[PDB]
RNA sequence: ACGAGAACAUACGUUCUUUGAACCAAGCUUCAACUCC
């Protein structure tokens, strides 16, 4: 199981509800949406969907990482038992569990001027990473196709505010074996690592002793082909990445657009870190 | 088929107005056109 490390040399804007604020990381269907839009840039979008639909391409979402420390969101248990301010724990320090600051959020103030009229300002929330940090994306069984797409994505930009002028990155794989054995392990409680949602006939079996938050996950369709306007998406509600489940489930790539000239998918497949 | 798409933090605006590098202060003090043969 491989690593995908993302080094940003420019600020990022990962919006979650509005342009004025931003988020440290980006989700999994955000990266999958970027890969779909770039694959239909290359025309190979159909067999990329047939790869990601049949589990050979299965990635988690982005996580913070500092120099030789890979992080995850604080897994949230039914713990009966200060470190309550900390949002991220190192990925190998879960056994110890049972200082940290990457970057700083900034707000960039912009304007749009009209020539024979008064101007109008708008402001963009940004995030800038420190010099020896960034984000990393977990992936198992790397494919030549996704190695080609991320090689091609880095000149289009992950992030929100494009193409002015923020999201750009250079990636490298840099596989690791100190944390592959964590994912080869098996335990009794399995934490989630991506924004996921089980299929309708297994949500009950997935929902037994869980600890989760829903997140709304919608927005606008970003294409020049979906139905001659800016149509919103069917707001899918997926589990938060810092969830825990005692029993596993497998997600689906749900179609959240069913009215334009092409389908709009949303990645909601599961990715577990099994722990005792 | 990225809470996304499109968007100059832009337009206007004299580091400027008033202000003697001035005031006070002897080119002066002491000296033989001279001594010797």
Numbering used by the authors: 1 to 81, 91 to 107, 119 to 296
Article excerpt on this structure:
The multi-subunit Type III-A CRISPR-Cas effector complex (Csm) exemplifies this principle and is in addition regulated by cellular metabolites such as divalent metals and ATP. Recognition of the foreign or cognate target RNA (CTR) triggers its single-stranded deoxyribonuclease (DNase) and cyclic oligoadenylate (cOA) synthesis activities. The same activities remain dormant in the presence of the self or non-cognate target RNA (NTR) that differs from CTR only in its 3′-protospacer flanking sequence (3′-PFS). The single-stranded DNase (ssDNase) and the cOA synthesis activities reside within the Csm1 subunit and the RNase activity resides within Csm317–19.
Two distinct CTR-bound structures were resolved from two major classes that have 1123344151crRNA1Target1 (CTR-43) and 1122334151crRNA1Target1 (CTR-32) stoichiometry, respectively, where each number corresponds to a numbered Csm protein. Interestingly, unlike previously determined thermophilic Csm structures that prefer assemblies with fewer numbers of Csm3 and Csm224,25, LlCsm prefers the longer CTR-43. In contrast, though no ATP was used in formation of CTR-bound LlCsm, we observed 3′-PFS traversing through Csm1. Four nucleotides, C(-1)′-A(-2)′-A(-3)′-G(-4)′ of the 3′ PFS in CTR make a 90 degree turn from the trajectory of the rest of the target RNA and rests on Csm1. Notably, three helices: α12 of the Palm 1 domain, α17 and α21 of the Palm 2 domain of LlCsm1 point their N-terminal ends towards the phosphate backbone of the 3′ PFS nucleotides, thereby forming a positive groove that interacts favorably with the negatively charged 3′-PFS phosphate backbone in a sequence-independent manner. The 3′-PFS-helix dipole interaction locks the two Palm domains in preparation for Csm1-mediated activities. Four RNase centers are observed in the CTR-43 complex along the backbone of the bound CTR. The 2′-nucleophilic oxygen, the scissile phosphate group, and the leaving group oxygen form the classic inline geometry at each of the four sites. Either an arginine (sites 2–4) or a tyrosine (site 1) residue is situated near the 2′-nucleophilic oxygen that could act as the general base to extract the proton. A large number of particles of the CTR-43 but not those of the other two complexes lacked clearly defined side views of the HD domain, which could indicate a change in the structural property of the HD domain when CTR is bound.
